């Protein structure tokens, strides 16, 4: 049993007709201190998978190392490592899920909330969540922590059920996610304005965007607000 | 008296370890394999005897990668070779895990060395029945190595072991003389394909399959990769041509 020290906030994601999109800001908080700002919480594995991690950062770095090893190991005595026998998003997820549950069962968890986003070899979109309890689930949209309360409601307005996926384009999807990131910056006291976003399309492959920023924010109305009730000036 | 060659860690009156020497015989009885160090990397090649038409071509790969920047090939008892590579792999993972940086070739060589030497210390184990040629690229250059069943190893410009080691060594020595400035990864691949064809005369009875791999700072980014398709065929020809 432990307690998280340096932490990453929300990880939001959703699937569209040809793939999945996932994003996470670049902050590493230390309690209420917004300590680190160049933290990448989106971990690409191969070119068909991206693992988004929230929670304890030291554990995240540990999962990072685990992931690099999987790649190395899978390459050993594997002549089809970059083909039929390359790592699938579902393999990467089942692995992590396995680890997460074993660690909670030993009463020594990896204090994280993880979302694995990717495209299977047959083109199917893959989006599943696993956390420090070993709990797992899938949904057209998935968000961790804070984004579960504020991002899912927005993303679900785009893809409310399975039949909505084929009707959603990368543009609409990326738009929804980018807007969600802005909302999270408005109400989440542990968020950052900078973030990374990744897209895994069954055609265009993996697109990884770094150094994005929340833009087009509305703050002007703040000038018209004074006092907390009766004050006039 | 006698019987000094029955137990593994026993010194004979002349100070030798006969079991290690007998292990060497198993190595000499194996397929020929080589390694060539080029100006910015290393190339590995091996002879794959085609026992019959039934062997699916290109499927039974013999060259093995360690971590992501090291290649290993060996002659002798194949299983022993795999055993040594599995260890090398744990050895490499351990090093990276602790020091973050991938294991340097010299460091890696000694890891394999101490392990192999370890198997000549007790009569409860048998020495390794293989000689291993391995190497790769690291923080400061390319490195080639050959490890004997005694645990002995040194850095090489070129190396060979197995049935046709003499032919190969002969060819390798020529290259060394005619190229004091250094061969290129591209050239070494061809040169390697040739040496193997030539050295195949000491086993000209059975048909064979060629296998090559390389690790070049400029050609593979310092990562170990297998020579396939066009580059492979081009090398096959270069050899088939100079074999006449």
Q: CA B192 from chain center: how many Å?
A: 12
Q: How far apart, in whole angstroms, are the C-alpha atoms of residue A159 and residue A138? A: 13
Backbone angles phi, psi at B69, to 5 degrees: -120, 10
Residues of B in contact with A72 (CB under 8 A): 67-68, 93
Phi-psi category of residue A125: left, alpha or beta, with phi > 0 → left and psi -120 to 50 → alpha? beta
d(CA B47, CA B44): 11
H or E element in which residue B28 lies: helix B18-28
Burial of A171 from C-beta contacts in 10 A (0-12 / 13-18 / 19+): exposed
CA B5, CA A229: separation in Å to the nearest integer?
Answer: 100
Where is chain A broken, named by the residue before each break, C–N > 2.5 Å?
none
* A130 phi/psi in degrees, rounded to 5: -150, 140
Nearest to B164 by CA among B58, B244, B42, B49: B49
Distances from the Cα of B213 to the Cαs of A64, B31, B64, in angstroms? 29, 17, 9
CB A174 within 8 A of CB A168: no
Helix H or strand E encompassing B165? helix B165-178
Distance CA B92, CA B96 (A): 6
Residues of B in contact with A77 (CB under 8 A): 61, 64
Residues of B in contact with A69 (CB under 8 A): 93
By residue count, chain B amounts to 244
For chain A, how many residues are written?
233
Four-way CATH pick for A1-233: 2.40.280.10, 3.10.580.10, 3.10.20.30, 3.60.20.10? 3.60.20.10
**String of DSSP letters for chain A:** -----EEE--EEEEEETTEEEEEEE--EEETTEEEES----EEEETTTEEEEEEEEHHHHHHHHHHHHHHHHHHHTT-TTTTTTTSPPHHHHHHHHHHHHHHHHHTT----EEEEEEEE-TTS-EEEEEEETT--EE--SEEE-THHHHHHHHHHTTT--SGGGSTT--HHHHHHHHHHHHHHHHHH-TT--SEEEEEEEETTTEEEEEEEEE--S---GGGGG--SSSS---
Phi, then psi, of A168 in degrees rounded to 5: -110, 130
Bridge partners of B44, per DSSP, are B35, B213
Question: Cα separation of A9 and A143, whole Å?
Answer: 10
B1-244 topology per CATH: 3.60.20
What CA–CA distance (Å, rounded) separates A151 from A13? 9
CA count, 13 A, side-chain hemisphere, A24: 31
| Angle at CA of residue B51, ends B60 and B147, nearest 5° | 60
Q: Best interface-test mutation with B: which of A61, A65, A72, A78 has the largest number of B CBs within 10 A?
A: A72
Contacts of B137 by beta carbon, 8 Å cutoff, 6+ apart: B40, B41, B42, B69, B105, B143, B215, B216, B217, B222
Q: Count CB pairs under 8 A between chains A and B.
A: 15
Q: A159-168 contacts: CB < 8 A, separation 24 or more?
A: A159/A14, A159/A15, A159/A16, A164/A140, A165/A15, A165/A16, A165/A17, A165/A125, A165/A140, A166/A17, A167/A17, A168/A16, A168/A17
Reading the block at residue B191, the tokens are 């040169």
Q: Could you give the strand order of the β-sheet that contains B41-49, starting from the edge strand earlier in sequence?
A: B158-161, B33-38, B41-49, B208-216, B225-226
Catalytic residue among B2, B31, B120, B132: B31
Q: How many CB atoms lie within 10 A of CB B243?
A: 11
Question: Cβ separation of B68 and A69 shorter than 8 Å?
Answer: no
E strand or H helix that includes residue B41 = strand B41-49
Backbone angles phi, psi at A29, to 5 degrees: -80, 160
Q: What CA dihedral angle connects A199, A137, A179 and A45, to 10 degrees?
A: -30
Least Cα distance to B149 among B122, B117, B121, B125 occurs for B117
Q: What is the CA radius of gyration of chain B?
A: 18
**What tokens does B160 get?**
């060979």
A141 is catalytic: no
Cα distance from A114 to chain B (closest Cα, Å)?
Answer: 23
**Resolution (Å) of this entry:** 2.5
- Picking from A200, A204, A161, A153, the residue whose alpha carbon sits closest to that of residue A179 is A153
Is B65 touching A (CB cutoff 8 A)? Answer: yes
Joined tokens for residue B174 = 């020529």
B68 and A72 within 8 Å at the Cβ level: the answer is yes
Give residue limits of the domains in chain A. 1-233
| Angular region, B15: left φ>0, alpha ψ -120 to 50, beta rest | left
Half-sphere exposure of B205 (CA within 13 A, CB side): 5
* Nearest to A11, CA basis, from A36, A43, A48, A37: A43
**C-alpha to C-alpha distance for A84 and A87, rounded to whole angstroms:** 9
Q: How many CB atoms lie within 10 A of CB B179?
A: 16
User: Alpha-carbon distance A66 to B35, whole Å?
Assistant: 32
Name the DSSP class of B244: -
- Coil, strand, or helix at residue B118? helix
Going by their DSSP bridges, the two strands A28-30 and A49-56 should be labelled as unpaired
Q: Which of B58, B48, B119 is nearest to B78 (CA)?
A: B48
Tell if the CB–CB gap between A72 and B64 is shorter than 8 Å. no
Residue of A77, A82, A84 best to disrupt the B interface, most CBs of B under 10 A: A77
Among candidate residues B88, B113, B112, B121, the one with its CA nearest the CA of residue B11? B121
Are B218 and B205 contacting, i.e. CB atoms less than 8 angstroms apart?
Answer: no
What's the maximum distance between 2 C-alpha atoms anywhere in chain B? 60
Which residues in chain A touch residue B226, judged by CB atoms under 8 angstroms apart? 79
Do A77 and B93 count as a contact with CB atoms less than 8 A apart?
no
Bridge partner list, A44: A50
């Amino acid at each position: 049993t432990q307690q998280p020290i340096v932490t990453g906030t929300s990880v939001i994601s959703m699937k569209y007709d040809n793939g999945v999109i996932i994003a996470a800001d670049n902050l590493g908080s230390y309690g209420s201190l917004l300590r680190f700002n160049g933290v990448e919480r989106l971990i690409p594995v191969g070119d068909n998978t991206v693992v988004g991690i929230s929670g304890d950062i030291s554990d995240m770095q540990h999962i990072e190392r685990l992931l690099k090893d999987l790649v190395t190991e899978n390459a050993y005595d594997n002549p089809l490592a970059d083909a039929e026998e390359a790592l699938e998003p579902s393999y990467i997820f089942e692995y992590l899920a396995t680890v997460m549950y074993q660690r909670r069962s030993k009463m020594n968890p990896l204090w994280n909330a993880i979302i694995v986003a990717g495209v299977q070899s047959n083109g199917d979109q893959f989006l599943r969540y696993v956390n420090l309890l070993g709990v797992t689930y899938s949904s057209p949209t998935l968000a961790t922590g804070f984004g579960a309360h504020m991002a899912n409601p927005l993303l679900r307005k785009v893809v409310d059920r399975e039949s909505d996926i084929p009707k959603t384009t990368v543009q609409v999807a990326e738009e929804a996610i980018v807007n969600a990131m802005r909302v999270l910056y408005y109400r989440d006291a542990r968020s950052s304005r900078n973030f990374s976003l990744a897209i895994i399309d069954k055609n265009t492959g993996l697109t990884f965007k770094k150094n994005l920023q929340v833009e087009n924010m509305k703050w002007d109305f703040a000038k018209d607000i004074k006092g907390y009730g009766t004050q006039k000036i | 008296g006698t019987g000094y060659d029955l137990s593994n860690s026993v010194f004979s009156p002349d100070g030798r370890n006969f079991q290690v020497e007998y292990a060497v015989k198993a190595v000499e009885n194996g397929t020929t394999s080589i390694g060539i160090k080029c100006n910015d990397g290393v190339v590995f090649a091996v002879e794959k005897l085609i026992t019959s038409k039934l062997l699916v071509p290109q499927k039974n790969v013999k060259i093995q990668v360690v971590d992501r920047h090291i290649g290993c090939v060996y002659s002798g008892l194949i299983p022993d070779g795999r055993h040594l590579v599995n260890r090398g792999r744990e050895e490499a993972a351990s090093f990276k895990k602790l020091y973050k940086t991938p294991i340097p070739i010299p460091a890696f060589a000694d890891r394999l060395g101490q392990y192999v030497q370890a198997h000549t210390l007790y009569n409860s184990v048998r020495p390794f029945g293989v000689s291993t040629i391995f190497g790769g690229v690291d923080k400061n250059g390319a490195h080639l190595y050959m490890l004997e069943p005694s645990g002995s190893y040194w850095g090489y410009k070129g190396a060979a072991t197995g049935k046709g080691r003499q032919s190969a060594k002969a060819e390798l020595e020529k290259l060394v003389d005619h190229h004091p400035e250094g061969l290129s990864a591209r050239e070494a691949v061809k040169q390697a394909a040739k040496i193997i064809y030539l050295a195949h005369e000491d086993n000209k009875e059975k048909d064979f399959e060629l296998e090559i791999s390389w690790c070049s700072l400029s050609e593979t980014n310092g990562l170990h990769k297998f020579v396939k398709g066009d580059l492979l065929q081009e090398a096959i020809d270069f050899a088939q041509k100079e074999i006449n």
